Write a protein that binds this ligand. Structure first.
Ligand SMILES: *C(=N)[C@H](C[C@@H]1CCNC1=O)NC(=O)[C@@H]1[C@@H]2[C@H](CN1C(=O)[C@@H](NC(=O)C(F)(F)F)C(C)(C)C)C2(C)C
Ligand SMILES: *C(=N)[C@H](C[C@@H]1CCNC1=O)NC(=O)[C@@H]1[C@@H]2[C@H](CN1C(=O)[C@@H](NC(=O)C(F)(F)F)C(C)(C)C)C2(C)C
Lengths: 306, 306
């Protein structure tokens, strides 16, 4: 029993982190086979960040301008190119610790673990969700860019995020590993703001199921609702619409507990309309939306990674 | 910016996890040099758990009765002994992945990361605190015993917890790596209950400082208090006493922010007496007590591990 915001084991990703320095600037890179992936703004000076011409700044860099270190060990750069907002530095040594891996572009609502790093070394690991406004609520400081977000499925690490920047309110934005930003953001120090966020309804329902599984059942009521009528309430409280696909994805937890998804929807409707009146669910005073259905099942069934 | 419940990178500990099977029962072990540490109740059958005589059950086991596997690879057991509530299985192969490590007995109030494991494989990592009642609020299922809790300082893993059992309310109990339980518990399926818990006052203050550092300052008031008068309020709300040592330990965060510890105490006093009136601090609707002063500084300054 118990339910925690649980991150993936980070060892496979730790073996891939390196330091990338270009002149003054040092940030993190990801070393897979003989390629190091890092944010392209490593090539910028504190002078011009308001709007760099990255393509131009890069023509004036050569391989030797990039100091890549894996721990103590320098890795010689033997080629370089830019793909959208990331640099790919070909090095003379393939990482012997390269896990089985894929690059994925996650969808808003999905979760992943961030391995926060500085100077190529890990500081810590935590779980996040890609928010509907394409930000993540992370914890990042100067020097953290190039830190990555990932999922693990058995033996395969799916890299889905690389960290690039921090928006007003202290939320964070970044790219997939092909260097394409999530959301309408770019890597320039200009006036950018996240869109209004929304609550990930299907994840809240998944967490309510997690609560029932753990014995925290006080919020279950006797009623049901239709999908359409539920979504009218969701909208008012800035919850995203629940689709039939969401309902189907909740099927395993619904089956395990015997609580139809629409019955759980009626219980969530009442929580939105009436609040929690000082009670908690799974120790929380607010409704939690950063556990997917798969996260709940993984944690409550003990899924492990090879 | 941002502030997250952050766990230590788990790679050093992952390389140490193994599966230990004795007859039916399989749980996790920790493989350091040529010794595997695991909970002694691996030698029990589902028949007698209400009160095993472990010393007796062990005399009838020989080395070959223990199947130890590190991934696919069997490790031959060449000796065995019991130390309090853990078994030490000497094996014929030293773990080549053994990190620099120590065994520590943590104090209530301190935090550590748990690497939850099943069948010798990691499921996930999360941060916990040793509660004043010597429990942790973890997430554990059948088969998770032998999962360990740890801190990292530079290159050194301090192992402080091994998981043994779950108490009513869904809280968890275990031992240090010398097999001595934290708290008044034992490894027998009998009526055991945690004592009444209390809130870790010094950690709440540390988190309030973390909030100020992140710009969330609405709860700061203009007043101060004495240590003695603050502790009278703390007591009423089931907060542990704040000592001068606690004040001194908060010195770095007090210096960084310019807010005297006793000024922050006056602000916490007001939160306890008046509540938060629907506001949040660092995204939370409740006061958080599972960040130590060192955790806050580590996260807000980017401390990394070699
Ligand atoms: C990479 N190491 C840092 C990570 C930032 C730094 C503080 N916390 C973070 O997550 N990334 C940057 O410094 C990027 C970088 C230029 C400036 N920048 C920002 O994150 C800035 N934000 C924005 O410009 C805004 F508001 F548009 F998001 C800053 C104001 C410094 C936080 C480039 C190339 C975007
Ligand atoms: C080790 N793999 C499990 C972990 C438990 C199992 C469910 N969630 C956990 O953390 N440990 C046990 O099964 C231990 C073991 C006997 C029974 N046990 C318990 O945790 C039981 N608890 C107690 O007896 C109580 F209440 F005293 F804490 C159980 C009721 C099965 C949860 C021994 C040797 C303690």
């Amino acid at each position: 029993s118990g339910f925690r915001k649980m991150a993936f084991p980070s060892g496979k990703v730790e073996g891939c982190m390196v330091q990338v320095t270009c002149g003054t600037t040092t940030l993190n890179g990801l070393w897979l086979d003989d390629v190091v992936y890092c944010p392209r703004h490593v090539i910028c000076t504190s002078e011009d960040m308001l709007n760099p011409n990255y393509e131009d700044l890069l023509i004036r860099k050569s391989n030797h301008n990039f100091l890549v270190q894996a721990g103590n060990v320098q890795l010689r750069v033997i080629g370089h190119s830019m793909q959208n907002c990331v640099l790919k530095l070909k090095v003379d040594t393939a990482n012997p610790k390269t896990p089985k891996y894929k690059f994925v572009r996650i969808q808003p609502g999905q979760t992943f673990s961030v391995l926060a790093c500085y100077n190529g070394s890990p500081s810590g690991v935590y779980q996040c969700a890609m928010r509907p406004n394409f930000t993540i609520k992370g914890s990042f400081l100067n020097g953290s860019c190039g830190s990555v977000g990932f999922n693990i499925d058995y033996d395969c690490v799916s890299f889905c995020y690389m960290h690039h920047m921090e928006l007003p309110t202290g939320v964070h934005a970044g790219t997939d590993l092909e260097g394409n930003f999530y959301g309408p953001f770019g890597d320039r120090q200009t006036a950018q703001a996240a869109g209004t966020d929304t609550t990930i309804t299907v994840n809240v329902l998944a967490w309510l199921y997690a609560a029932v599984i753990n014995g925290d059942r006080w919020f279950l009521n006797r009623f049901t609702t239709t999908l359409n009528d539920f979504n009218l309430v969701a909208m008012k409280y800035n919850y995203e619409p629940l689709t039939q696909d969401h309902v189907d994805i909740l099927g395993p937890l619904s089956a395990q507990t015997g609580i139809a998804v629409l019955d759980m929807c009626a219980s969530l409707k009442e929580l939105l309309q009436n609040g929690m009146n000082g009670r908690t669910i799974l120790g929380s005073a607010l409704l939690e939306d950063e556990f997917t259905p798969f996260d709940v099942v993984r944690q409550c069934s003990g899924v492990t990674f090879q």
